[PDB]
Amino acid sequence: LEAKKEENLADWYSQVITKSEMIEYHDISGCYILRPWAYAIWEAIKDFFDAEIKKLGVENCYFPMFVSQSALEKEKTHVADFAPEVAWVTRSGKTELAEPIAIRPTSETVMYPAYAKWVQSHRDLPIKLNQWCNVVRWEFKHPQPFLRTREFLWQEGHSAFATMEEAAEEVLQILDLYAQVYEELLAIPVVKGRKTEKEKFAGGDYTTTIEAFISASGRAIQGGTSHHLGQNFSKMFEIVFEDPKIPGEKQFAYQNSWGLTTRTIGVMTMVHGDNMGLVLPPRVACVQVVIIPCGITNALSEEDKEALIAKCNDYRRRLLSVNIRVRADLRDNYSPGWKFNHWELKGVPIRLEVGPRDMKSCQFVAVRRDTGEKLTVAENEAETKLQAILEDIQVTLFTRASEDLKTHMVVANTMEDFQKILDSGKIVQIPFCGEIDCEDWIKKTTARDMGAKSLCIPFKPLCELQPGAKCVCGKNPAKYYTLFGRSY
Amino acid sequence: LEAKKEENLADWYSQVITKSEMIEYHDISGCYILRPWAYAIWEAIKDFFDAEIKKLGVENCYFPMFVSQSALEKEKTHVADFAPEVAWVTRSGKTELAEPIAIRPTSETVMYPAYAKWVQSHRDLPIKLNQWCNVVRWEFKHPQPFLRTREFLWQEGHSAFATMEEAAEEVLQILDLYAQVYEELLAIPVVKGRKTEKEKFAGGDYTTTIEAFISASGRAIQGGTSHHLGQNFSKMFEIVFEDPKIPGEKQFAYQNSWGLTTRTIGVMTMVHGDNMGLVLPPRVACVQVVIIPCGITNALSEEDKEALIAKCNDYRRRLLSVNIRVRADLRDNYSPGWKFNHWELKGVPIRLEVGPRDMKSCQFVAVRRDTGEKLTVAENEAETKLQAILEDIQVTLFTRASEDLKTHMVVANTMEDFQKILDSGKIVQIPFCGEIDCEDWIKKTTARDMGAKSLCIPFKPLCELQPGAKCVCGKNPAKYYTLFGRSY
Ligand SMILES: [Zn+2]
Ligand SMILES: [Zn+2]
Numbered sequence: 001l002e003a004k005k006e007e008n009l010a011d012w013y014s015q016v017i018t019k020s021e022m023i024e025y026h027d028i029s030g031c032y033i034l035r036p037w038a039y040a041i042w043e044a045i046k047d048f049f050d051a052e053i054k055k056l057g058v059e060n061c062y063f064p065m066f067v068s069q070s071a072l073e074k075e076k077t078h079v080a081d082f083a084p085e086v087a088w089v090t091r092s093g094k095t096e097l098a099e100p101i102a103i104r105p106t107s108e109t110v111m112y113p114a115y116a117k118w119v120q121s122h123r124d125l126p127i128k129l130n131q132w133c134n135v136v137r138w139e140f141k142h143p144q145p146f147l148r149t150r151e152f153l154w155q156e157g158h159s160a161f162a163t164m165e166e167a168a169e170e171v172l173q174i175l176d177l178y179a180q181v182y183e184e185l186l187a188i189p190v191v192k193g194r195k196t197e198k199e200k201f202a203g204g205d206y207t208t209t210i211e212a213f214i215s216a217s218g219r220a221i222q223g224g225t226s227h228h229l230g231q232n233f234s235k236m237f238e239i240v241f242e243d244p245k246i247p248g249e250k251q252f253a254y255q256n257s258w259g260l261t262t263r264t265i266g267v268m269t270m271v272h273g274d275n276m277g278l279v280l281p282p283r284v285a286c287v288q289v290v291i292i293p294c295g296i297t298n299a300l301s302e303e304d305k306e307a308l309i310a311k312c313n314d315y316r317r318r319l320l321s322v323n324i325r326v327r328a329d330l331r332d333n334y335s336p337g338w339k340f341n342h343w344e345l346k347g348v349p350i351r352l353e354v355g356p357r358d359m360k361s362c363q364f365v366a367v368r369r370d371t372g373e374k375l376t377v378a379e380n381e382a383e384t385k386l387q388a389i390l391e392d393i394q395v396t397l398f399t400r401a402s403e404d405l406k407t408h409m410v411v412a413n414t415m416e417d418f419q420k421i422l423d424s425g426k427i428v429q430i431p432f433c434g435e436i437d438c439e440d441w442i443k444k445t446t447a448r449d450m451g452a453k454s455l456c457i458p459f460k461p462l463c464e465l466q467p468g469a470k471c472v473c474g475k476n477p478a479k480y481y482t483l484f485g486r487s488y
Numbered sequence: 489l490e491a492k493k494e495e496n497l498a499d500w501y502s503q504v505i506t507k508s509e510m511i512e513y514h515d516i517s518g519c520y521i522l523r524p525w526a527y528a529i530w531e532a533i534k535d536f537f538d539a540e541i542k543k544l545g546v547e548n549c550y551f552p553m554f555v556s557q558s559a560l561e562k563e564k565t566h567v568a569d570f571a572p573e574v575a576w577v578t579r580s581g582k583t584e585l586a587e588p589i590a591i592r593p594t595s596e597t598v599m600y601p602a603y604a605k606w607v608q609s610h611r612d613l614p615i616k617l618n619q620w621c622n623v624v625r626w627e628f629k630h631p632q633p634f635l636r637t638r639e640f641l642w643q644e645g646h647s648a649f650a651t652m653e654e655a656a657e658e659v660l661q662i663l664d665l666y667a668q669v670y671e672e673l674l675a676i677p678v679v680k681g682r683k684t685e686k687e688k689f690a691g692g693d694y695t696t697t698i699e700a701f702i703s704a705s706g707r708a709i710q711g712g713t714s715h716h717l718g719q720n721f722s723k724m725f726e727i728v729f730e731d732p733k734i735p736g737e738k739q740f741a742y743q744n745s746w747g748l749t750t751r752t753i754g755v756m757t758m759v760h761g762d763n764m765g766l767v768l769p770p771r772v773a774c775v776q777v778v779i780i781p782c783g784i785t786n787a788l789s790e791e792d793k794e795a796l797i798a799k800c801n802d803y804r805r806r807l808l809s810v811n812i813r814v815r816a817d818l819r820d821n822y823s824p825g826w827k828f829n830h831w832e833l834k835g836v837p838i839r840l841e842v843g844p845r846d847m848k849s850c851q852f853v854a855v856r857r858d859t860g861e862k863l864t865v866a867e868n869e870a871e872t873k874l875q876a877i878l879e880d881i882q883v884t885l886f887t888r889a890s891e892d893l894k895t896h897m898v899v900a901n902t903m904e905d906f907q908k909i910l911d912s913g914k915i916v917q918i919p920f921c922g923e924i925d926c927e928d929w930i931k932k933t934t935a936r937d938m939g940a941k942s943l944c945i946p947f948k949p950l951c952e953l954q955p956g957a958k959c960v961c962g963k964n965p966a967k968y969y970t971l972f973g974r975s976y
Contacts, residue, residue: 034550062522
C-alpha cells in the first residue's frame with residue numbers, strides 16, 4: 001500500500017481497511033459502513049458462536065431496544081446509575097411527540113422487567129437468551145473503526161438461574177467460546193482472566209475477560225467479557241421465585257451477562273495484517289481460494305481461452321465439493337497481475353494460478369498469502385493439497401501470534417522493572433495489592449515516565465506469587481499477579 | 489384455548505401468539521418481544537433466502553440507519569417527499585446535542601450516496617447489497633403483532649445495474665424467492681402480480697408483489713415486494729458512469745428494491761392455526777418432532793424409568809442423524825398429558841410418544857399435529873417413516889391452503905357480482921380501467937355496501953379479458969383483470 005505498518009500504524013490501518021473494501025466512512029462519526037468483506041467475517045464468527053451457545057441451551061430472540069419515559073418516571077423498570085447516555089427521540093418530523101422515546105438505554109432496562117414477568121415458579125428456570133443487534137455510544141476521542149467505535153455490531157447474552165453454581169458454570173463456558181473465537185477462528189492467542197475491582201462491571205459481582213495483545217502499537221485489547229451479576233439485578237427488578245426446599249421465603253435469581261463485538265475484526269487486522277495489506281485466517285475468510293487464469297496473451301487462441309476457463313471452473317466445482325470457499329476471477333477487464341494484487345490486499349489465503357503451460361503438464365500453482373510461498377500442485381491432488389495448505393496457514397498465523405504473546409508478556413517484580421519493560425512496548429504481569437487507588441496511581445505514574453491499565457488477573461499467571469512479595473506500590477502486600485499494559 | 493378462531497379471530501390470534509410463547513407485549517405499542525419460538529421461524533426463512541440470493545450474487549452488509557441534519561440541509565443526500573416520518577434524536581440525557589441525528593429516515597437516504605461514490609466506471613457494476621435489520625414506523629390504528637406493526641424485523645435488498653434488462657431480471661427472480669418462502673417454507677399459496685398505479689411504490693417505475701389470502705378474516709395480505717426503480721434515484725443521487733459504446737454522455741444506473749418482513753409469521757399463524765392453537769409447517773418448525781415419555785406411574789420401576797429415558801434418547805440421536813429437528817421433553821415436573829397440550833399449542837408437527845407397553849413390542853407412536861392422526865411405528869423404521877410424515881404434513885398444509893385460495897378467489901365481470909362476491913368473504917378478479925380515481929371510487933363504494941383495495945394485477949389471470957369488456961366503473965374500457973379485496 002502507501003503506508004508501512006511499522007512506520008505509521010494509524011495510516012496503515014486506515015488504508016488497509018478501506019482498500020480491502022471492508023469499511024466505508026459514513027456521514028456520521030464513529031459510525032461506518034460494514035461492507036460484505038468485513039461483514040462476512042462477522043457472519044463466520046456469528047455462525048460458529050451461535051452454534052456453540054445453542055448446545056448450551058441459549059436461544060435467540062429480539063428485544064425492541066427503545067423505551068418510553070412513561071415507563072421510567074413510573075418505575076416499571078429502572079435506569080442504573082453507572083449508565084450514560086440515554087439519547088431521546090422527541091420529534092416525528094417537526095411535530096413533538098406525545099410519548100418521546102429513549103434509545104438504547106441499557107439491555108437491562110428493557111429485558112429484566114420481562115424476565116421478572118416470565119419467572120413465576122422454579123420451573124420457569126433457567127432463562128437463557130441471546131440477541132444479535134447493534135449498539136450506539138455517544139462519547140469519543142478519535143474513533144478508530146472496530147477498536148474504539150461509537151457504533152458497532154455485537155451479541156449479548158442474558159441468563160437467569162435458580163442457583164449460583166449454574167450461573168458460575170455458564171460464565172466460564174461462554175468465556176471459553178470467546179477464547180475459541182479468537183484462538184480458533186481468528187488464530188489470535190488470548191489471556192483468560194478476571195478483572196480487578198476497578199475495571200470490573202459495576203452492576204455485577206465479578207467480570208471475566210479475554211485479553212488479546214497487539215505488538216504493533218505495543219498495546220493490549222479486551223476481546224470479550226462474561227459477567228456474573230449475582231442477585232444485584234434480580235433484587236433491583238424483583239426477578240423472584242420460591243423453592244420448596246424452603247417453602248418459604250422468596251429467593252432471587254442469579255444472573256449473567258456476556259457480549260462479543262465486531263472489534264474482533266480490528267484485532268484480526270492489526271495482528272495478522274501485512275505491508276501488502278489484509279491477511280485473513282482461512283477459518284473466517286469469505287473466500288479462502290481465488291482461482292486466477294494466468295498467461296493470457298493478445299496472441300492467445302480462442303479455443304484455448306475457452307479451455308483455460310473450463311479448467312478454472314473444473315477446479316472451482318471440485319473445491320466446492322470439499323467445502324472450500326472458492327472464487328474464480330474470470331474477468332476480461334483486468335490484468336491477472338491486477339487480480340493478484342487485488343486479492344492479495346484483501347488477504348485471500350490461497351491464490352490458485354491456472355496457466356496453459358501448467359495446464360499442459362496437467363498441474364497448477366497455489367500461492368500462500370502469509371509466507372508468499374508458491375507450490376506447484378498436481379491437478380489430481382487439488383482437494384487434499386489445498387485443504388492441507390489452508391489448515392497449515394491457520395496454524396502458522398496462530399503460532400506466529402502466539403510467539404509474540406510469550407515474547408511481549410513478561411514478569412516484573414518491582415516498579416522500576418515494570419516501567420522499563422512497559423516502555424519497551426510489552427504488557428506486564430506484576431504483584432498487585434488489588435486496590436483501586438493503587439490502580440489509579442499506577443496509571444498516573446506510568447504515563448509520564450499514556451498510562452498502563454489493568455487488563456485481567458490471569459487464571460494462570462507465569463509465576464507463583466511468593467509469600468511476603470510486595471505490590472509495586474510498596475505500601476501493601478501483593479494479593480495476586482496482575483496483567484498490566486497500555487490498552488485500547 | 490379460550491377462543492374459537494371462527495367466533496373471535498382477534499382474541500383467538502392474541503391468545504395463540506401469547507400462549508405459544510411467540511411474542512410478549514412490550515412497554516411500547518406496536519412494539520413487541522420476539523421470543524425464540526417465533527424468532528426461530530424467522531431464522532429459518534432467513535437461512536433459506538440468504539442462501540438463494542447469494543447464488544444470485546447479492547452480498548450482505550451493514551448500514552448505520554441514522555443520519556445528521558448536517559447532511560440533509562447541505563444536500564449531501566436528499567429526503568424524498570412521499571416518505572414520512574423522520575424522528576430525530578435531540579437529547580443525550582438532558583443535554584441537547586451539537587449534532588442532533590435522524591432515525592431511519594429511509595434506506596435510500598443512507599445508502600445511495602455511497603452507491604454514487606462506489607460507482608466510478610462500468611466495471612464497478614452491478615452493485616447488489618442486502619441487509620437484515622429492524623425498521624420502525626410512527627403511525628398506527630390498532631397494531632396487530634406481525635400483520636400491521638409499528639416495529640418489525642425484515643431484510644431489504646438494493647441493487648444497481650448498467651442495463652435495464654439486468655435490473656428487470658433480478659426483480660422477477662427475487663419475487664419468486666419470496667413466492668417460495670411462502671409456498672415452500674410456509675406452505676402458503678400466493679398470487680404473483682404487478683401493483684396498480686395507485687398502490688405501487690412512488691419512487692419506482694413498477695412494483696411486483698406476492699399476495700396471500702386469509703380465509704379467516706376473508707382478507708388478503710401483501711407477502712413481499714420487488715420494486716424496479718429505474719433511474720429515478722440514480723438521477724436524484726448522481727449514481728452515474730460512462731459506457732464506451734458511447735464515449736460519451738453520462739448514463740444512469742438502473743436500480744432495484746426488495747423487502748420481506750416478519751409478517752410471514754402472522755400469515756402462517758392465520759392460515760394454518762387451529763382451535764388447539766399454533767400449527768407449524770415442518771419446513772420452519774424450531775422443533776419438528778417432540779419425544780414424550782408416556783406411561784409413567786407412581787408405581788413404575790426405577791430401572792424401567794432409566795430404560796424408558798434411554799430409549800427416548802436413542803430415538804433422539806437417530807433423528808438427529810437424519811437432520812430432523814428433535815426435542816425430548818424429559819421432565820419430572822409435568823404430566824405427559826401436560827406436555828402433550830404444551831407442544832400441541834406450540835404446533836410441533838409430530839408428537840413421538842414412547843411408552844413401556846410399546847417399548848416392549850419394540851415400537852412407538854407418532855402423532856400428527858395437523859390431522860391429529862396417530863400411527864404406530866416400528867423402532868427400525870424411525871428415520872424413514874418420520875421424515876415421510878413431515879413431508880406429508882408440509883404437503884397437506886399447502887394443499888389445504890391452496891384449496892382455500894381457488895375457492896375464495898373467483899372472477900366478477902360486473903360491479904353487482906363484485907359486491908355480492910366480496911361480501912361473501914372472498915377476493916375478486918375484475919375487469920379494471922387501471923385508473924387511480926376509479927380505484928379510489930371502488931374503495932369508497934364497496935365499503936358501505938371496510939373498502940375493497942387493489943391487490944395486484946396477476947401475471948396469470950383466471951380468465952382472458954374479452955375485447956370490449958368494460959371496467960366495473962362502466963365509464964371506461966377494461967385494461968386488465970385486476971385482483972381486488974379488503975386487505976390488511
Ligand atoms: Zn499497591
Ligand atoms: Zn373504471
